[PDB]
Amino acid sequence: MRVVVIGAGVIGLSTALCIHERYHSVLQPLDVKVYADRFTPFTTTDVAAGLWQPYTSEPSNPQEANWNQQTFNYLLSHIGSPNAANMGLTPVSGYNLFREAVPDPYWKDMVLGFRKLTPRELDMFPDYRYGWFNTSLILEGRKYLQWLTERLTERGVKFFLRKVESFEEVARGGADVIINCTGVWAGVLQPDPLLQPGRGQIIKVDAPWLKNFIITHDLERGIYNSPYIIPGLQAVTLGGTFQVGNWNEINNIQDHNTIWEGCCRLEPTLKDAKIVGEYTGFRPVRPQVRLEREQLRFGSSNTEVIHNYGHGGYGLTIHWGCALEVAKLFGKVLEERNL
Amino acid sequence: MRVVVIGAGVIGLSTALCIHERYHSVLQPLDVKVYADRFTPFTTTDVAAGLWQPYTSEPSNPQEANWNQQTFNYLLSHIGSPNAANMGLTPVSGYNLFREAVPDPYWKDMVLGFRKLTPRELDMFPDYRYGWFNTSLILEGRKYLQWLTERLTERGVKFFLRKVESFEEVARGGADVIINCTGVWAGVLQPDPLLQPGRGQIIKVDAPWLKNFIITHDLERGIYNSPYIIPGLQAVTLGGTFQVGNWNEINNIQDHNTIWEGCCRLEPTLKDAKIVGEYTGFRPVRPQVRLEREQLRFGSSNTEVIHNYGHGGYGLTIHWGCALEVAKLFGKVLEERNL
Ligand SMILES: Cc1cc2nc3c(=O)[nH]c(=O)nc-3n(C[C@H](O)[C@H](O)[C@H](O)COP(=O)(O)OP(=O)(O)OC[C@H]3O[C@@H](n4cnc5c(N)ncnc54)[C@H](O)[C@@H]3O)c2cc1C
Ligand SMILES: Cc1cc2nc3c(=O)[nH]c(=O)nc-3n(C[C@H](O)[C@H](O)[C@H](O)COP(=O)(O)OP(=O)(O)OC[C@H]3O[C@@H](n4cnc5c(N)ncnc54)[C@H](O)[C@@H]3O)c2cc1C
Numbered sequence: 001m002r003v004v005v006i007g008a009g010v011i012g013l014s015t016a017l018c019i020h021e022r023y024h025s026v027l028q029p030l031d032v033k034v035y036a037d038r039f040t041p042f043t044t045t046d047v048a049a050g051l052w053q054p055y056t057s058e059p060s061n062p063q064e065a066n067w068n069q070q071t072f073n074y075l076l077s078h079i080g081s082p083n084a085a086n087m088g089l090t091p092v093s094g095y096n097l098f099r100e101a102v103p104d105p106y107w108k109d110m111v112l113g114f115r116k117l118t119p120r121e122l123d124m125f126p127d128y129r130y131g132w133f134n135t136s137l138i139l140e141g142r143k144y145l146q147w148l149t150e151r152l153t154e155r156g157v158k159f160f161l162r163k164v165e166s167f168e169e170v171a172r173g174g175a176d177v178i179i180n181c182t183g184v185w186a187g188v189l190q191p192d193p194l195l196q197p198g199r200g201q202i203i204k205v206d207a208p209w210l211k212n213f214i215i216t217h218d219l220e221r222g223i224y225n226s227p228y229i230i231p232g233l234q235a236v237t238l239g240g241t242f243q244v245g246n247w248n249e250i251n252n253i254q255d256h257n258t259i260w261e262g263c264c265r266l267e268p269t270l271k272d273a274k275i276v277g278e279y280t281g282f283r284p285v286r287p288q289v290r291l292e293r294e295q296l297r298f299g300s301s302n303t304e305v306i307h308n309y310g311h312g313g314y315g316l317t318i319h320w321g322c323a324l325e326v327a328k329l330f331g332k333v334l335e336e337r338n339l
Numbered sequence: 340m341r342v343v344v345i346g347a348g349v350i351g352l353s354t355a356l357c358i359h360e361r362y363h364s365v366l367q368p369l370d371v372k373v374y375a376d377r378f379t380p381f382t383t384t385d386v387a388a389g390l391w392q393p394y395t396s397e398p399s400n401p402q403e404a405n406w407n408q409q410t411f412n413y414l415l416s417h418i419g420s421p422n423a424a425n426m427g428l429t430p431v432s433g434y435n436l437f438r439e440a441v442p443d444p445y446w447k448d449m450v451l452g453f454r455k456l457t458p459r460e461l462d463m464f465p466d467y468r469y470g471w472f473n474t475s476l477i478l479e480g481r482k483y484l485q486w487l488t489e490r491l492t493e494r495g496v497k498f499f500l501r502k503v504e505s506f507e508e509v510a511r512g513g514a515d516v517i518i519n520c521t522g523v524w525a526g527v528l529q530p531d532p533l534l535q536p537g538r539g540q541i542i543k544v545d546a547p548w549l550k551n552f553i554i555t556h557d558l559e560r561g562i563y564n565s566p567y568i569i570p571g572l573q574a575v576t577l578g579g580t581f582q583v584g585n586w587n588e589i590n591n592i593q594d595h596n597t598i599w600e601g602c603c604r605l606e607p608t609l610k611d612a613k614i615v616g617e618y619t620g621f622r623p624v625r626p627q628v629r630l631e632r633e634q635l636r637f638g639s640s641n642t643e644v645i646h647n648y649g650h651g652g653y654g655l656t657i658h659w660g661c662a663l664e665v666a667k668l669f670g671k672v673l674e675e676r677n678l
Contacts (some may be wrong), residue, residue: 079463082607090548090608091463093432093474112460113472121451123417124430135432135472135551199426209429209572211550212474233548269419 001337002029002174003330004294006164006189007181007270008036009043010141010319011149015179018323020155034152035170037163038147044183045315047281048141049202049230051092051213052317053222058106060288065323067289069110074320075137085233088143090252092231093135093215097122097128101218104132109137125266128216136213139316140232156258164189167296171303177333178305179326184284192290195310198283199246200240202226202254207273210236219235224313226261235276240264241300242313244285251278286310291322293329304333340368341513341668345503345528347375347522349480349658350647352487354518357662358504359494359671365678368449373491374509376502379484383384383522384654386620387480388541388569388576390431391422391656394562399627404658406628408449413659414476424572427482431570432474433552434460436467442560443471450475463606467555470568475552478655480573490606505527506635510642516672517644518665523623525648531629534649537622538562538585540594546612549575557606561651566601574615577602582654583624591616625649630661643672 005016016032024030038273040046052075054068078084079091086291095117108114114134114202124129153159164170169187170178179187184197215228224242230235264270295302306329308322344355357373363369366522372640379385391414393407418430425602434456447453453473460469492498503509509517519525531643554567561579570576579598596615628649634641645668647661 076459076463080465080607085608085611090550092550112457113451113454114479115454118451119417124415126419132561208547208630209424211429211570240627268419269424273419297479 001029001176002031003033003177003179004047004170004173005034005179005181006170007033007037007183008039008145008159009045009181009183010032010315011183011311011322012036012179012181013152014319015181015326016157016310016321017148017152017333019154019327020152020157022327023330023334024155027334031153032157033195034157034159035162035164036159037161039121039159039161040149043141043145044283045141045145046219047202047279048316049228049239050088050138050232050316052106052139052141053215054105054107054219054314054317055100056105061240063325064289064318065106067318068107068314071318071320072110072137075139079137079147086143086256088138088140088233090230090233092138093126093133094138094215094230095131095133096215096217097125097131097200098217099127099129099219101130107108108134138232142314144242145234148250152205166301167305168298171296171298175303177330180305180307180309181298182309184282186284186307190284194264194286196244196285197247198285198312199243199280200239200241200247200283201251201280202236202237202277203256204279205270205273206239207236207270209269210267214266227266229260229263229267232274238270242283247268247282249280249281249299270317283312284310284315285312289322291325293333301303302311340366340371341370342516342518343509343512343514344347344371344373344461344518345509346374346521346522347378348384348520349654350520350522350661351369351375351518351520352484352491353658353662354520354647354665355496356487356491356494358666359491359496362669362673363494363667364586366673371496372676373496373498374498374501374503375498376451377490378500379481381660382480382484383620383622384480384484386420386541387655388567388578389477389479390569391426391478392554393444393446393650393656394631395441395444395556402664403628403657404445406657406664407446407653408660409663410657410659411449417486419478424484426486427477427479427572427653428493429476429477430570431477431552432580433569434464434470434472434553435554435556436464436470436554438466438468440469447473465592474633476570477571479654482572483527484567503666506642506644507637508635510640512637514593514642515670517642519646519648521643521648522650523621525646533625535583535599536586537624537651538582538587538619539578539580539622540590540598541573541576542575542595542598542614543616543618544607544612544614546575548608549606552633553605564604566598567600568606573582581622586621588619590619604612622651623654624650624651628661630664632672647668
């Protein structure tokens with residue numbers, strides 16, 4: 001059947017692969033195509049700090065906790081292959097610092113080695129007073145997007161640079177099923193007032209001596225509104241901004257300065273780091289991932305649409321669980337159509 | 340007074356600085372000079388993997404344990420300054436893997452976060468069956484040697500490229516005190532059958548995605564005779580050889596192959612690493628650090644000699660404790676001479 005995925009960010013590509021991986025065998029004819037108006041390096045995914053770490057607060061949908069877990073185990077299963085770095089993966093250990101005691105995250109047990117910092121540890125970070133340590137994984141968005149792209153391409157999936165104006169337009173094109181993985185732009189194909197851009201700028205820097213991630217938190221100020229430093233495969237990502245409702249896509253000088261000075265304070269050796277670039281992107285903020293099936297009549301054609309968007313500051317961290325869930329709904333769509 | 344340090348490896352330079360730092364104030368005249376036939380990048384120190392980690396077994400002279408501890412705290416005290424990376428320092432977390440249970444090292448409490456690996460952790464390293472994890476520090480020998488060198492130079496200490504033939508030769512040159520920090524070559528100035536070269540080759544590689552150290556152990560085969568990978572500031576050090584009594588200073592292809600294949604098996608992603616160089620050096624192996632004062636009559640001149648050599652595979656790890664001890668003996672020499 002004709003299936004069309006709209007989106008080429010981590011959600012779209014992982015989902016496409018996930019399904020094709022499960023159904024090519026079963027459905028003889030299984031035509032996947034991917035439409036997107038932006039491919040890496042232009043997706044929001046390419047801008048991601050690259051770390052696997054859910055929010056500190058519990059999720060609204062409890063399945064989100066599963067999805068996160070399934071994603072981590074799936075990623076860990078690759079640690080050990082010769083390809084892990086080629087897919088954009090590597091373990092990284094690091095700190096979560098806070099200004100005051102805070103309850104353990106629901107994810108303490110998903111990551112490896114979770115534990116509270118000791119005082120000699122905290123002495124390395126004077127403004128903070130409570131914190132955790134745990135090892136997790138890095139999944140660079142750009143590298144991972146390219147990897148999924150080659151995998152998809154070899155499985156025969158086709159890509160097309162296109163801006164979709166409506167699902168109708170796609171249904172008319174003969175799509176039996178359509179997977180919406182439009183990220184913050186999903187509202188355009190169909191309004192969702194719950195969805196909003198969580199803008200964030202980052203500064204990429206060359207500072208190889210930094211081997212661990214460090215993430216600061218300011219409870220008053222909101223998540224990701226505080227300095228964080230996260231080593232990646234080739235460079236370090238400096239960061240710190242999450243602004244809901246802001247659509248400005250231009251890097252701004254003010255954000256740059258606050259991110260730089262904050263990090264520079266937290267890790268003074270940054271003094272010698274070479275800045276390699278700055279970027280801004282929109283977390284697709286929503287109270288809960290919208291992941292559900294919906295049918296659409298276009299005259300005489302029910303065309304299923306399965307949504308998968310609204311991942312906020314955690315799309316990398318949970319993409320696999322969602323891709324699986326979508327495969328499952330797609331499974332139902334198949335049994336209704338009688339395979 | 341005239342003081343002459345023989346050696347420009349980590350032991351000689353740290354010791355010189357240590358003393359000058361303590362006595363320049365007190366002794367009005369305090370003439371330090373450093374003689375060495377090899378300066379960085381030619382010392383054994385420049386070849387060090389760069390990690391702070393004592394042996395797994397406990398020391399013979401118990402003071403070694405304190406020297407190690409004093410060294411770690413001294414190093415940690417710098418984590419936080421803007422200069423830490425310039426001195427060659429950065430924290431690094433990592434694994435010690437073994438083929439069977441083993442008792443906790445006497446140093447578990449000196450390092451940060453020591454703990455035993457869990458099974459999900461061990462699944463990332465299939466040949467191994469027991470292990471630890473802890474964060475420690477990297478101190479790159481080459482960078483640190485250059486840093487100490489600038490510090491010494493600015494304090495007015497003088498350097499001279501000179502092969503010393505005998506202490507006599509130096510005493511005749513008017514040295515009131517002489518600090519022997521000759522490493523494996525100390526036997527030449529005065530025989531010590533306990534001292535032997537622990538040869539070791541390493542391969543430097545460019546593989547920035549590796550953020551944690553990994554050190555393997557084979558009990559039958561001896562310490563450091565097993566693959567280990569240790570990220571440094573700019574490159575990764577691959578290693579694995581410790582051969583007592585071997586004086587071959589030439590890198591050999593057999594060692595290279597075994598080190599490469601072993602590491603490559605332990606971390607398959609090395610498949611894509613660029614090799615940047617290979618080097619070999621001699622750990623100054625001895626059952627215990629020789630650190631003691633000895634007087635020497637050269638006709639009518641007692642000339643004190645204070646030895647500090649025999650640090651094996653742990654000179655970086657303990658250099659500061661020793662430098663302090665030497666300053667202390669030097670202190671006595673001063674009170675005997677009545678300041
Ligand atoms: C600065 C920053 C740091 C972050 N760090 C992390 C992190 O460390 N860890 C983590 O887990 N998460 C992180 N995130 C969150 C993560 O980046 C997002 O959750 C995730 O990238 C969303 O992916 P997506 O595919 O849904 O969106 P995108 O990657 O933006 O993909 C959307 C795709 O849909 C296409 N598209 C949209 N509308 C149309 C249309 N009308 N027609 C055709 N194509 C269309 C776009 O071209 C693009 O191809 C971060 C985000 C930001 C901004
Ligand atoms: C491959 C390898 C990996 C290692 N990794 C680590 C590690 O990760 N961590 C750790 O703690 N330790 C490590 N070590 C051990 C550490 O390298 C040695 O303990 C330490 O470098 C010894 O320093 P030193 O100053 O005593 O010797 P050197 O640095 O070799 O200094 C000796 C100095 O004396 C000079 N000299 C000698 N004889 C004379 C003479 N007759 N006249 C004039 N000058 C003379 C030499 O030119 C040189 O200047 C490692 C060693 C090796 C070989």
